[PDB]
């Protein structure tokens, strides 16, 4: 008998633009005349619930709230908890969820690598790697566009925020993506873009493309007696 | 009430070539005097197991089994079966365990790049990565050679055999690993040992210098 | 009356993954009814002995057969036995034998050379050297690869762990591979790969091609 709450995460932030919190819950029977509520900080009056999710597999029952916060009071780091009211248990369910921070804050650093050439000799695919580096705390974004169109999210993979060896608390992230060689090899920009907290501007974007190296080759011809 | 055991991973077997498997008896209440044993295919006997574990400091007690055999009989598929044996246990239980031998191999292609040009500017650190794909099944094992001797898993980072999006049956993994600019600019070949059970010899090699992938700048052509 | 038995052998191992055991028998009058028995250390048998050889052609006796121990034994050490039962004497012939410890494991050191310059004029052949210095004990096992596909062990040539002049307890050896010039001359990475026991991953490997003799900083042409 656990209860789930999920704060407002940066990703769907950022996806939908439509902030929502949920907790569900779990390890309950199938059973109705069960509400549930959200309270704020101060425990004020919430919106009512919606989309109530199916029961599990296992044969016991779940379920999901709703509700609309702003940021401007979700960053205060102020708690929030969700009432929940099971008929078996006498003591509702309460769960606390909020931001301490408080943490050392750095902006992430972002490079692309342009794929290895004995890749590039087979002639099938080539991948493109955009390591995000030295950002606390977690919950960042990438996402990959194409002169202006984002890519079809089935194409790239991102990976998820894992502590750095040599800095205290500091996450690391990376992000590979495929493309045919055929295309590669004409042209195209690749942009990366990450969207953290701590960014000023919160959204950076880093993009390369095959011909960003080649520094000026030269030709000598020394002629003599020809 | 809870039953488990640790199958020996092929990490397990290449980081001291000493397979072994091992009962995980955790979830229980604080007790001594725990027996755990482990069975052939047909009924016979096992080695005399020892060096138990102890209790958990969150009111759970964990009982560690030490059960050895040879890579060549795990390998042909000897179906064992850990029976664990307590006062408060009331009756015998049986755990089977095997591999789902008839799974597609494939020889994992490494590929081995550099660090980033604009990080080489802050003269601080570079992050080498190692990047295996395309590779069957999954559970491979990749360590750091500098040169001669190896390096401690507690500064480079492996991530897990996540499926790859492009090839479903195959799959893919990142190693990195962090170094100072002045190791980065005085050799240092810095190669990158995987190991994968679909190689011809199980273990391959990949090599980069700081010196290796620059073009050729002049082109000189003496003229007579 | 003197029986030889022939030890489990590193390159045996590596080459087959299917390790056996085999004892000889010779000096002795051909005669049948023999049968030699395969007990181990601890006195319990194994696997059966197969294909039951031929006397030798020099009024002499000869029995050889088939075991499967997994390598765990050998390297702790137990100690096989090949009871041969011959109607020469009454007395069982009863031998045994196992391995040493007390061997300094340094590393081996591979080098590979190119061709010759004035071998590349005639355009019919060419041979390619692998070669192998300051290791003990004689353990090599060397072998080529091209393009990842194993080549046919005829077409190169092994020596044996010859000592070192200078070195008191180290030896070396040798390995050539005889191939098409114009094949020479299109790539073909060759590379010749080691095996011994005092590497730490037991397999090393080192590549030469026509593009390792170039200084990759300018190219020199002499155009007429
Ligand atoms: C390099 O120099 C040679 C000699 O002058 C000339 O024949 C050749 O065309 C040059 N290559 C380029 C790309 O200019
Ligand atoms: C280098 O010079 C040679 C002639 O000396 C020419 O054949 C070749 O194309 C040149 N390389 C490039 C990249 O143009
Ligand atoms: C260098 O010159 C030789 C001789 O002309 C030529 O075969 C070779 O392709 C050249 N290399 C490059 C990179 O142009």
Not at 4 to 18: E, R, V
Not at 108 to 116: H, Q, S, T
Not at 124 to 150: K, N
Request: include cysteine.
């Amino acid at each position: 008998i656990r209860v789930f709450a999920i704060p407002p995460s940066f990703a769907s932030i950022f996806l939908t633009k439509s902030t929502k919190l949920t907790c569900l819950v779990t390890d309950l029977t199938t059973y109705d005349s069960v509400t549930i509520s959200w309270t704020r900080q101060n425990g004020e009056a919430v919106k009512t619930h919606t989309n109530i999710s199916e029961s599990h597999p296992n044969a016991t029952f779940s379920a999901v709230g709703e509700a609309s916060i702003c940021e401007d009071d979700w960053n205060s780091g102020e708690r929030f908890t969700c009432t929940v009211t099971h008929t078996d248990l006498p003591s509702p369910l309460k769960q606390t969820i909020s931001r301490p921070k408080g943490v050392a804050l750095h902006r992430p650093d972002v490079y692309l690598l342009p794929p290895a050439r004995e890749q590039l000799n087979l002639r099938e695919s080539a991948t493109i790697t955009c390591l995000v580096t030295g950002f606390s705390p977690a919950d960042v974004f990438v996402q990959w566009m194409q002169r202006g169109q984002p890519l079809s999210p089935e194409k790239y993979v991102t990976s998820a925020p894992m502590p750095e060896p040599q800095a205290p608390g500091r996450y690391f992230a990376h992000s590979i993506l495929t493309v045919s060689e055929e295309e590669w090899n004409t042209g195209e920009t690749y942009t990366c873009v990450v969207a953290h907290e701590a960014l000023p501007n919160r959204v950076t974007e880093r993009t390369v493309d095959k011909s960003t190296g080649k520094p000026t080759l030269y030709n000598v011809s020394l002629v003599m007696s020809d």
